[PDB]
């Protein structure tokens, strides 16, 4: 018999982003969000431009797609709407009545692609609005013209 006690551990490190990569974010916004590095930075950028609500709707969407629960898939759906797709909502994203209306009609029998349009709608804005406005900012200049060469 020997008394023993376990203990926690420490994480590790790894690459982040390369020059030939940072540029890939220019072509399609997705590449950016997908990349942990580009994403983290992308967010902050918005927070300053009071346009962080645009990304939020995106992150949530994905977090909703991975919803198997028969109640959550529906209930949760209304949540995102009452937050963004809600009248004068606090984070009401930028979506004309056209797209906005869509989601609503998709709140009846929502499953996974409930916010298919709304998602692609905002995503297309953060890629043609912020994306192009993020590269011009320093946050980007440091990603490509940082402590490394181009």
From Swiss-Prot:
Disulfide pairings: none
A single cellular component GO annotation: cytosol
Taxonomic source organism: Homo sapiens
Organism phylogeny: Eukaryota, Metazoa, Chordata, Craniata, Vertebrata
Keywords: Cytoplasm, Membrane, Signal transduction inhibitor
Name this polypeptide is given: Regulator of G-protein signaling 5
Transcription regulation among keywords: no
GO biological process: G protein-coupled receptor signaling pathway; negative regulation of signal transduction; negative regulation of vascular associated smooth muscle cell proliferation; regulation of G protein-coupled receptor signaling pathway
Entire protein: shown range: 44 to 180 of 181
Function: Inhibits signal transduction by increasing the GTPase activity of G protein alpha subunits thereby driving them into their inactive GDP-bound form. Binds to G(i)-alpha and G(o)-alpha, but not to G(s)-alpha.
Encoding gene (name): RGS5
UniProt GO molecular function: GTPase activator activity; GTPase activity
Presence of the UniProt keyword Cytoplasm in the record: yes
RGS domain boundaries: 28-144
């Amino acid at each position: 018999g020997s008394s023993g006690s376990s203990g926690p551990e420490k994480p590790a490190k790894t690459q982040k982003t390369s020059l030939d990569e940072a540029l890939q974010w220019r072509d399609s916004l997705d590449k950016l969000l997908q990349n942990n590095y580009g994403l983290a930075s992308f967010k902050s950028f918005l927070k300053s431009e009071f346009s962080e609500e645009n990304l939020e709707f995106w992150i949530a969407c994905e977090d909703y797609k991975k919803i198997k629960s028969p109640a959550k898939m529906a209930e949760k759906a209304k949540q995102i709407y009452e937050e963004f797709i809600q009248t004068e909502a606090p984070k009401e994203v930028n979506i004309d009545h056209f797209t906005k209306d869509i989601t609503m009609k998709n709140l009846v029998e929502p499953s996974l692609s409930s916010f298919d349009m709304a998602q692609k709608r905002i995503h297309a804005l953060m890629e043609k609005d912020s994306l192009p406005r993020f590269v011009r900012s320093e946050f980007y200049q440091e990603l490509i013209s940082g402590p490394s060469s181009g």
